[PDB]
């Protein structure tokens, strides 16, 4: 019939409670020595299913895995971010539900130099036999014997630089009794609960979610039938391949989940950028004038970096279905973490300051100014771009708009809460374009990630449906793709035109400096002196023979699977070289390098048991093979790797190729007998 019910559903969704959160975290011991924030029977924890029955169901397995990663973030910023403490004069308290609201003062400078703001948790200790003698850390509050955690609610600036600031605690916490007129209490900041809150919301309302039911059964749209001219003239008028304008087509074409998956360098943001192009152009082509909400695309990411990549290649403007440039009215979110004219001047702050002028350099007018501003930028807006989490901000949720297609870039770095987040503005389609061959999003409890929190929606629906592969990369030289390809993609993950030319180094002249070589080190720890030498007299080689020619500055990364040997590596090479190779090599561990890429890069492998083992292998191997763009040197022991298909795979393909070298200390040293002689009997 008429279903108001969305708009009820909205409101639902919109207006979560968070008193049921809070009454379970202002309970919490800030001096708990534990992984877990109580002491429940373990079997209360479960694992994220495949599949869920009902919202109930999800909720009973994600409610736990939340509140013990948001236990985990208490524990870390105790017990390392070294917050600096202050202390409130005390005033009056109010009941509220199961809750007291403290009322108490602080000096705005406090405020400032401390960095609270309302979105702050913070915990109160008494510390009676303290005096201004020592330095007070959150240490003291971590040994204090009657500590209280509360949430800050309001933050009033006054007259005389004060701030009148309103606090939460539990109406059970016997700390009350500690919270007389006019006491002095110690106080120190926590962790900002933001985004713990918006997950929350997104937790708990998911029952009205247009989408609740693909994102319970990790269950995408199947895919409906377009027009082979239709992928034709998007793949011409976008200048995309063929697998990116059949994605762009299926996915705007069809409604509910659809999954793009984007291996390194096959043009995730550039198929995105398309996507927004075709929706914008095929939305706008569908007795007095009625008045129109304008369509709008939600477009997130889980990172500001991702989300600030995205808004400054629209910049350039997007196309329609013949090829023509528009340019849609742009809005980033939320501030940035990095500075930048380009993207600064997309944010609806400075959006709001360009239209408002300098009316109001009186503040009621000033404030009524901006909110007038900011409801007419979002509503002539085309696109709002914002982290996962951005979209859950006021901003957008008192716009009263449904945003019904959200595009997620990076789908595959973060949580399932976090990508279900934008979705709560009355979604009903969203494609998410990621690559699930890397390693999941870091986590900092390790027992909730044990229990699959660090699993994406991405790859949570990737179990059951084929997404739309992007299968052409324009990075890496054609060797350093070849394994890659025929190990991971069937061998069918295809280079760019050129690869070879854009990617030919002048090292790649002298052996064994190749764009893809496998040393085997003739030669149960974690460490390898004899990798470390290999690897030092390789970068000795390619420095003697051509920095006087070119600069190495940014062009090495170094990596390995152990962080004890990168430490054994990172201290070697600084013996050796000394300091000036400091701009020249990065060095990391596979799981530390995962967002970057070098022309250049060296692996240890070192050494080589259960699935979950086998896919954590499958996805370290996927990232480490596909950091470096014109040359790779993989140095390894045969036999101490061979226990794995996987490397033992990749050691008989580099044969197979030509490309593995014997390799000892002395091997590029026709003078050293020793090595020669080792190298000479093999
Ligand atoms: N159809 C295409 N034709 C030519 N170059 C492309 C195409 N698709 C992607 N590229 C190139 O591949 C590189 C990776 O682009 P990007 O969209 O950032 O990929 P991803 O987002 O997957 O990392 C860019 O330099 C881009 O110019
Ligand atoms: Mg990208």
Not at 154 to 173: E, P
Not at 476 to 498: A, C, N, T, V
Request: proline share 4%; glycine share 6%.
């Amino acid at each position: 019939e008429l279903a108001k019910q969305e708009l009820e559903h909205m409101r639902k969704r919109l207006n979560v409670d968070m008193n049921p959160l809070y009454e379970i975290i202002l309970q919490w011991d800030y001096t708990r020595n534990s992984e877990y924030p109580d002491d429940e029977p373990i079997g209360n924890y479960s694992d994220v299913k495949d599949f869920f029955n009902s919202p109930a169901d999800y909720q009973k397995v994600m409610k736990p895995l939340l509140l013990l990663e948001s236990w985990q973030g208490l524990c870390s910023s105790r017990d390392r971010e070294d917050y600096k403490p202050f202390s409130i004069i005390v005033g009056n308290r109010t009941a509220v539900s199961d809750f007291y609201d403290v009322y108490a003062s602080v000096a705005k400078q406090v405020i400032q130099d401390c960095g609270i703001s309302e979105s702050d948790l913070i915990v109160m200790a008494y510390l009676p036999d303290f005096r201004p003698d020592k330095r007070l850390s959150s240490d003291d509050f971590k040994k204090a014997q009657h500590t209280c955690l509360a949430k800050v609610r309001t933050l009033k600036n006054t007259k005389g630089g004060n701030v009148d600031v309103t606090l939460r605690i539990h109406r059970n916490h016997s700390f009350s009794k500690f919270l007389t007129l006019r006491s002095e209490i110690y106080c120190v900041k926590v962790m900002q609960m933001t985004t713990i809150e918006r997950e929350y919301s997104t937790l708990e309302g998911l029952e009205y979610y247009d989408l609740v039911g693909q994102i319970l059964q990790a269950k995408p749209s199947p895919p409906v039938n377009v027009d082979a001219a239709e992928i034709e003239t998007v793949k011409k008028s976008y200048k995309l391949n063929t697998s990116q304008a059949e994605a762009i087509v299926n996915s705007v074409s069809k409604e509910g989940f659809s999954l793009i998956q984007g291996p390194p360098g096959t043009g995730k943001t550039k198929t995105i950028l398309g996507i927004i192009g075709y929706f914008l152009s095929t939305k706008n082509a569908s007795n007095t004038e009625q008045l129109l909400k304008k369509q709008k695309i939600l477009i997130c990411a889980p990172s500001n970096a991702a989300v600030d990549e995205i808004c400054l290649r629209l910049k350039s403007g997007v196309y329609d279905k013949q090829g023509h440039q528009f340019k849609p009215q742009l809005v980033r979110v939320g501030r940035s973490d990095v500075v930048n004219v380009a993207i600064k001047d997309l944010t609806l702050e400075e959006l709001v300051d360009k239209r408002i002028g300098e009316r109001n350099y009186n503040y009621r007018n000033r404030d009524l100014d901006r909110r007038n501003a900011q409801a007419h930028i979002l509503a002539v807006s085309d696109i709002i771009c914002s982290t996962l989490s951005g979209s859950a901000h006021d901003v957008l949720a008192t716009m009263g708009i449904k945003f019904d297609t959200v595009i997620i870039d990076e789908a595959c770095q973060c949580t399932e809460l976090s990508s279900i987040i934008p979705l709560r503005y009355g979604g009903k389609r969203c494609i998410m374009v990621g690559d699930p061959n890397q390693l999941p999003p870091t986590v900092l409890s390790g027992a909730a990630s044990n229990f699959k929190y660090n699993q994406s929606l991405f790859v949570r629906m990737e179990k059951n449906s084929s997404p739309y592969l992007l299968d052409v990369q324009y990075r890496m030289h054609p060797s350093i793709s070849k394994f890659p390809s025929s190990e991971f993609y069937q061998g069918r993950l295809k280079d760019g035109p050129g690869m070879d030319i854009l990617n030919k180094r002048p090292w790649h002249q002298l052996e064994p400096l190749a764009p893809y070589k496998f040393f085997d080190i003739i030669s149960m720890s974690y460490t390898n002196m004899e990798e470390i030498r290999v690897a030092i007299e390789l970068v000795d080689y390619l420095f003697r023979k051509f920095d006087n020619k070119i600069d190495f500055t940014g062009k090495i990364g170094i990596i390995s699977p152990y962080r004890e040997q990168m430490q054994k590596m990172r201290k070697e090479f600084a013996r050796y070289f000394g300091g000036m190779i400091n701009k020249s090599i990065d060095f990391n561990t596979i799981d530390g390098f995962q967002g970057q890429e070098k022309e250049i890069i060296l692996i240890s492998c070192v050494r080589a048991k259960s699935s979950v083992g086998f896919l954590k292998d499958f996805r370290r191997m996927n990232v480490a093979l596909t950091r470096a763009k014109t040359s790779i040197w993989v140095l390894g022991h045969q036999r101490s790797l061979a226990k794995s298909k996987l490397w033992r795979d990749l050691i008989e393909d580099a044969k197979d190729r030509s490309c593995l070298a014997y390799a000892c200390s002395g091997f590029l040293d026709p003078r050293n007998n020793r090595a020669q002689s080792i190298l000479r009997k093999f």
